[PDB]
Symmetry: T
Subunit: 141 residues, 12 copies
């Protein structure tokens, strides 16, 4: 029923800045699309963004305690944070990793994720629709 979408550092700058790498859709507009898609699927989406690791960890903690699924785009922390991975390892419901850009076509450091190995699955490079497709997966599981 309830799906948590969690965005990490820099994702609040979406759409306003570089449309070429990530599209012209803003973060508020992303929230609205996610919410609408969720309703259409019979789900409720709770969308949160922070530049602060501590805050992201708290939000993951709450999803772990509530047994709720998580769609996570951790931004740069995807490649760097062991703490984020430790928090995600506690989740009993599915974890879907989402990236807007195709990280496998970019710098080598973007091609390693601490989250991919413990995630149910991973969607990258499909832009904003990535989030919407992850919702649909959760709806049919």
């Amino acid at each position: 029923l309830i799906v948590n979408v969690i965005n990490g550092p820099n994702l609040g700058r979406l759409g306003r800045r570089e449309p070429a790498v990530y599209g012209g859709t803003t973060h508020d507009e992303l929230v609205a699309l996610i919410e609408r898609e969720a309703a259409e699927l019979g789900l409720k989406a709770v969308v949160r963004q922070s530049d602060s690791e501590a805050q992201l960890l708290d939000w993951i903690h709450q999803a772990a305690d509530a047994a709720e699924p998580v769609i996570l785009n951790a931004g740069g922390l995807t490649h760097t944070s062991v703490a984020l991975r430790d928090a995600c390892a506690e989740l009993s419901a599915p974890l879907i990793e989402v990236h807007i850009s195709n990280v496998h076509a970019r710098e080598e450091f973007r091609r390693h994720s601490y989250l991919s190995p413990i995630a149910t699955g991973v969607i990258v490079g499909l832009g904003i629709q990535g989030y919407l497709l992850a919702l649909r997966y959760l709806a049919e599981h």
Copy 2:
């Protein structure tokens, strides 16, 4: 309009063998689900499977000449074939890479793809629905 789904080696054994790694859905059943989903989206899906690299290359050649999108699960060739990548580099329409299992949770050799860097995007670990979600992406682009 027309979307080519191309499956590589061993994907014909789907469902019949190990349900634990890849699910109990067979290849014919996968074809039927794909076709039905495509119709619902206003698309036509042409689904092909081969254990032969030469055959896969021919099918990619035809999609390149027809300017048609490709959803590709190359099986083991994903990690090994430069020729498959060279053929895919000719595609002008989108290439979506799909894997049923989460390759990033398996042996290290499965975590490298010759296709990921030239693909539009990549879906892994979402099972058979991976293909269906790739169709939906193509429908809205």
Copy 3:
């Protein structure tokens, strides 16, 4: 006399979550055991936990200024944070690194620590008692 025990990200979830990896002892219960052991040793233990790197750095700063020893379980930051190491390099009194789990029996990324090279010593895999044994070391030095 005064010993600072500093716990990093996720250590507040102790005991409540996965008992199999880290034991069924909670963080409050860990604090109580540490305090009791310290008194028995003639020491005072000040136990602090945060998911926030900035907060951990402040607590290390204060131990550096007060010339006090530190027992540090930095959680995931153990493997990732150069800033935490820079702060610890200022400590003139002993630094004992403690991990509950045996990090050397886990993923390769857990087998590298930015803290181990500048620590007096390191205890891992002895569970919660690790902290208590570190206290006893400090008491006899």
Copy 4:
């Protein structure tokens, strides 16, 4: 006209602690020297320091929106933070990376920077004057 000098973790401990590695000049004294040098150059320097990544990201966000140059000494985050790099990639005006110590004469992990590749240039090992020389570069460009 306006130049933002941004200091990351541990840089508030300057001068007060180890003079041997980083000099006896304190952070407040660094601010005063920077301000004075800026005035002499016809610039205004806004100098900010934080141990918190989130705060550093916000300050980089504002420089990106205001089209202002940045002189950045990210401390330990220089070697570890992809998020900091993503924020800096948005800057349209020059980014000068500055380190007080010669990081290339220290541990191997200090010889890799996520920031160097996207910076205009890099000054290291010239102590506090590093900042002043970066100001002069910006003044003549």
Copy 5:
């Protein structure tokens, strides 16, 4: 009840030679401290040292057959011996690895252990007290 302390090559030279790296406590004096601490804990400590791998293997064999715990400082063999590890893999009671010096602050070859991954836990850099703290762990488990 019975705890076997096994020391490998060069550990008989303790105290007599370099006090700076390993302390001024000799091997006989180490035996006496261990014995006294064990009695205080309600245990019996059997302390053995050899420069001969074959001898160390025999002593590990006997602990395996008697179902007794082992505290092991294998000296240089820690980093080099697969045979020692194979023998230790047979132990059903706890194995605690102990090193006097902080091996993680020394040459890179000292930072890899064939024993760490199969040990219950590892204490390094706490000097001779390392052995005593390992005894206390065994006493409370």
Copy 6:
């Protein structure tokens, strides 16, 4: 008082060739700017360029014997010459390494320097002004 500026292979082609990578300022013009800046600082700059390693070594030898500081842009030899480093290790006065281009944004082989570890500091990517800023450092030390 006297500062030696030493340029290695290819630096005589400056300005005349590719302005895009290194600027439109020629080597003679660089000499004139350096000389003028030095006078303004109360210094004398002696600027030398050679494509010959032997010649560069002789010039470093003389600075070593005269106890004079060196500003060195060794060109390609920066990444390749152990002999140049051995000669520079004899210098008792400061060595400042300067590169016009940001070597850390270029091919991986340009990101390693045999000189950086023994230099006082390093300026890269600030163009021709790099030399001038190195002079100013020497003037205030």
Copy 7:
């Protein structure tokens, strides 16, 4: 009862070409020896060779469906084919890997096998008799 011997690329050239690396026994002669040895053991050997990966995969598919053991010398595909490994992972009866030459005394690329980790065991360097000894193993298991 039935044992499938499967030979990959180039193995049809046996004996006719270089006797020095692989012996003077031809492929037809190998078939005859295998058949005779099998009869003596109370088994039936079905020996197949192809230069085509697709064909080898089909033959492995059939052994998987029939629950029959496989003795496999995949030739060059031993070191290169993930698809061959995926097909072999389905086998429920034993897989014995056989190579005529000692691959561990040859080029480094011959010392890695995608098949070795999932095989029951591996015989190399014992020439043609390798196949015969693998038969004998299967006969007594």
Copy 8:
């Protein structure tokens, strides 16, 4: 007298597709140029292309049995196929490796060839003329 030119996967798409990487000369046109050049040299050129490894191996087998020279552009198989190399190791007459593009200016995986070490020599980056120049070498040897 007779020279075999063998082209691997994707080389049938020549000229028709991307002229920018490989030129606007088609495969049939390449055959005609090769034939004409061969006649002028007093040779006969037999030019074959396949996307199928098995087919390429058969053609190499025949050149081995006939003691005839081979000019080989294996396409993607150049970087991936041990089987192709094993077949080429049997050739007693010269093997010239040819690539149209300069593989050393492209992705790192194109800079390794299983064929280069056993080839007489290698021509890359000289386009279609590469084949013609290889013919001329064979004519004068």
Copy 9:
């Protein structure tokens, strides 16, 4: 005629300990099977086991002087001992390396052998029968 079977460290614990990794056949029982198989083959088998490298070297020395073949399972020394390899390099008669377990399915350090490159061939993972099959090879050569 005479075949020396030499077993290294820990192989005396066979059968008595972990049957799951190595089988329930003991070392004395292994000796008896080897002897019986040898007689049936017209050979004499001399079977020796030691945990001492020096002893193994002496036994290899004697086989070198007597020009006798060796079947060697060096245990952990397989992966670690250059001295054992130097002794084996003197053998003029065949050396067959045997391991009970499939070392290629275990830890990465077990997948490197100092002996494999100088051995005639290698049998692994076929259990105790490995030794018997090595005898049969020697009998027919």
Copy 10:
């Protein structure tokens, strides 16, 4: 019209020394063959050899200023010199790299070239004729 052939260190010893690695053709004889071939092609070849890097750089400088093509066999400097590469990067006309021996069949250090990535193409292992074939390429382009 004018083609510069530039030979680096040791190439003056050609033919006189080891004929087995490089052929019995001397450097003067190489010059004569090159000149004759050039005339036949309607070109003028200017052939220069030096053991001195500085001299080679000067000759490359002149070809850069005159907009003339270069055929370059840099000898050992091929694998070691960044300065030589920097000089060659200025050439606007084609650069053909030539080596007499097949460097890809020799020591691993000969398989890396600083020149290959910026060269038009590369000919190796075709002996002295390599130079002649490079001339013919330039003639038809």
Copy 11:
């Protein structure tokens, strides 16, 4: 005055076996040459050989206690033994490492020594005379 020459595993087989790699001089003959050379130099040479690490360690222990120089050819243990290095680190008088063969022209594993970094110096490839030249060094120091 007294110089200890210590030989490790396999060195007792000298001269008797392979003269091609190590010369036809036997170990007893080596002892005699060493003794004679020592007398001529005014020294006493005590020459010891063992295949047993424990024995070598004891002999190093005695040289450490007696403050006597050591000439050490540890055989295979040169590349493998940390324990041997730990024992040698205690020596206050010079340690000269000697190898008969040129280890740098042999397998890569022979090109790493645990002893070289703590030795005064190293002589390799000069055969038996290596020992004699090491004596002469000790005589003049």
Copy 12:
């Protein structure tokens, strides 16, 4: 009879500069000691030093043509020059590599030599006497 001693870059600064790393013996004094030792041995020593690679190559060329032995301390070029190695490969008489300092106790880049693999043998760390001991080797061979 005639022995050529060749010294590379920086060796002319001997003794005059840092006595701590290389001793207080100057280059002229080294020449005199070498000459005197040679006479005593019945040899003639010709000692040459240059900072110029070209010059060193010429001197090696002459020793190759005259069939004379070489004692070579190439300085920094030891670790960097392929050209120097190519020249030395032509020598038919012995090549002894000599270094004053123990390069194996210094930076990792000093532990690789392009010359060691083709040299007869190598002496390092025995100071100036290294040269004298190399002479004595040549005298008795």
